[PDB]
Amino acid sequence: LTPEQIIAVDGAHLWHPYSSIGREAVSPVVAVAAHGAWLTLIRDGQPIEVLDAMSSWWTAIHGHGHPALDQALTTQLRVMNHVMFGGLTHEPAARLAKLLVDITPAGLDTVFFSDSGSVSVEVAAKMALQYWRGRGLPGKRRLMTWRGGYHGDTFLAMSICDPHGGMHSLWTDVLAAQVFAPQVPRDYDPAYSAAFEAQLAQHAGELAAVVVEPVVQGAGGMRFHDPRYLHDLRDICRRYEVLLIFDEIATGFGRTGALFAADHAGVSPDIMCVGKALTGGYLSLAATLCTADVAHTISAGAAGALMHGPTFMANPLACAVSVASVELLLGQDWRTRITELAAGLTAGLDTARALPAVTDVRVCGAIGVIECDRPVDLAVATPAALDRGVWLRPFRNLVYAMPPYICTPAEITQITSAMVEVARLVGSL
Amino acid sequence: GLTPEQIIAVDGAHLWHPYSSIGREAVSPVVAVAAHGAWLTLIRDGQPIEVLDAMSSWWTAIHGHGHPALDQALTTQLRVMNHVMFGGLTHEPAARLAKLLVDITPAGLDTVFFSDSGSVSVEVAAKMALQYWRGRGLPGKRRLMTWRGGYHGDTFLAMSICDPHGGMHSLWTDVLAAQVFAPQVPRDYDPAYSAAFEAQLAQHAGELAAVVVEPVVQGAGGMRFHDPRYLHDLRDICRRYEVLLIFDEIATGFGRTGALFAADHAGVSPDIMCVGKALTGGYLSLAATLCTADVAHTISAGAAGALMHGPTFMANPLACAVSVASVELLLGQDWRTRITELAAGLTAGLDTARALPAVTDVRVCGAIGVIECDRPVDLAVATPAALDRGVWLRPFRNLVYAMPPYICTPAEITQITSAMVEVARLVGS
Ligand SMILES: *Cc1c(COP(=O)(O)O)cnc(C)c1O
Ligand SMILES: *Cc1c(COP(=O)(O)O)cnc(C)c1O
Ligand SMILES: O=C(c1ccccc1)C1CCNCC1
Ligand SMILES: O=C(c1ccccc1)C1CCNCC1
């Protein structure tokens, strides 16, 4: 297929994310290669190189086509593509589980592999529900979260998405009815924690778990909050006997400046979800971790088992590339790398603050955000970014980036420069 | 690097397996160290032994493991582009696969939504159905109807249409959506069943978005077969009462039952279809949900204006590329004759089991063979028995069953069936 043929097939037959068939104002761009921090895209019939400022939605932390990851995949492919995890185990699964148990917050000792973040969230909920049934308290059935959140697109995951402003707002009448605390503020305010506790207190006997994105809320608005709130959540959950679940599917593996965002508060949840960057952006894979206490209580219960088991559970190919990706991350001074990225984003985005349509500029590790006073029009933003050699994907009123960790300072500068120019265009027609 | 002994230690301490416990499983997982063609290399008492993958690693490995054409397709794509985000970009693997799938599926299915797993593809199908009727101004049409004995995955909406006993709804009382269940569909065709189905559906039509079933073969709910004419009746009933029809072909697709898709046995097209397990030839997790032009535009024209779903790894280039190769490999051979020979080999090999004391039925459909016993099959006994005979089997409940790779020779099918007969011989003593 030529690029024009791809476009024709795509228009006729392919659903894209959060889209319609045949009613999108701006058509998809054909991507034909990816290498390191760069994509080759087709524009007006010609190949152009642009920076993947989005890391392909958080995934490409080491860039595309990294030699260590490529070879880990081809090495595993030579030996064993996949076997069923029912009654069999294998080296990639064990090596990855060992790595994950070692580097996640203390106490997370068991690992359930699945194929996507949304499924890993459903597994986390299932763990929490089965835990309390194992305790003989089946009334502990509901989840609590704060507003502004996002946890995936399957129907249980949707139930803890922000109900008034979240992307799943139209489904509230058919979703499970969960408990929502107000939006968590950026700056630390003890009164917010006090109110959260008071609200949790009156629902405690029906709550299985609190589920939150720690430090950074992604798809709900790229909002940051003070890590001290996570400390308060841990304390509150401990005292009222409610499990604490951290969704680190976006925040994991160095992105926020710590290995996991939980680490900013030195807090360990009872259950944790990871994904997006787990395989370094090669393949779909996710994992749900829980404490030995949660596992044992589930295993000692009436069920005697966690009733979940995806067909491709612990896929050897995905696990092998994940092992290589994590080892690559840990074998380098990733902390210094991310601090340098954050400095580069901060310095590059600073002039956006003075722009007329810009309401806030904020950076947290290798995440840079320009918040605008109006929704960003992709028809204007997308060519403006491409003209400057950068692939950006704004959403709502946000021009934001999460670059690969391998980006040089010059590349971060090119990215922040494109972001600023997109923001400038927002405020001038 | 890990020895098989170290793998067992890590596994027992840190890894969840499908529908299992931590630290309480009677039969420890067996270490798999390689897979090629129809064969797995497993560790038994410290020794590596090659055994037949009679399960095709849960329906997935239809061309066997490490097939040169599929290995090649993967490595070829890996050199050009591992992954890019599907939000605003498209690519050749996604287009080639979409074009293939719309061409070979039942008539009328011309749009494709890619996701990462079967369970997610089922949730997408449900969401399509519900959003369809919202698009027609009938939001009351929000329940699903199915027959008993079904299985559709492990996420919470998927669980709601699983057989109440199979999916242990006992444990999940009003956690799950309450759906409408018709009685178990019989093996042989009885028009009275369809008439009763219709009468039940008629009572609920104003609140039903869709009927969802596995066509011809019910997999994880009991490996039961039913006459394809029932699907003809469902299509008619759904058309007359304005309820959508969804076929879940995640286990039945790509030739497994003797037709390219099980629906083709009845010559019926559903409004929405799910595929998954064998889509990638068993290399990587991938699934897809297809729908008609009517379904797609009714969704796209509705007030909501977009299908709000979009997995991070949607339409992953590596998974799509190996899928293209797998599908083309299937289509480029006389697959119909291959399956017929496989079916004949299963029939001949399993006939001996009919006369066994513990055996209540023996049945074959395409490349699927089942021995149904009168009591649970003991894994502690069955698994070394099969391994002694060079065959990996994974019995479930009272069923000794197989779905071998399409590449299995007559000699290999003889080996597989003889292991099945002997497992079925040990149960009844
Ligand atoms: C992306 C994401 C998910 C869902 O992951 P998918 O792979 O898209 O199913 C869940 N939670 C958070 C916080 C995420 O960023
Ligand atoms: C296996 C299966 C599913 C679920 O697929 P996963 O990849 O395990 O989520 C759904 N429906 C049917 C009919 C299946 O056989
Ligand atoms: O990671 C995401 C993201 C994060 C922040 C802002 C917008 C989308 C996407 C959320 C929707 N599914 C694909 C990934
Ligand atoms: O396909 C399956 C199956 C099929 C028939 C009998 C038992 C399990 C499994 C069902 C549970 N998830 C992994 C696949």
Swiss-Prot record, chain A:
Competitively inhibited by KAPA at concentrations above 10 uM and by amiclenomycin. Gene3D superfamilies: Aspartate Aminotransferase, domain 1 (3.90.1150.10), Type I PLP-dependent aspartate aminotransferase-like (Major domain) (3.40.640.10). Pyridoxal 5'-phosphate binds at G117, S118, D247, P310, T311. Disruption phenotype: Cells lacking this gene are shown to be highly attenuated in a mouse tuberculosis model. The record marks Y18 as: Participates in the substrate recognition with KAPA and in a stacking interaction with the adenine ring of SAM. One of its GO terms (biological process) is biotin biosynthetic process. PROSITE patterns: AA_TRANSFER_CLASS_3. This is Adenosylmethionine-8-amino-7-oxononanoate aminotransferase. It comes from Mycobacterium tuberculosis (strain ATCC 25618 / H37Rv). The gene is bioA.
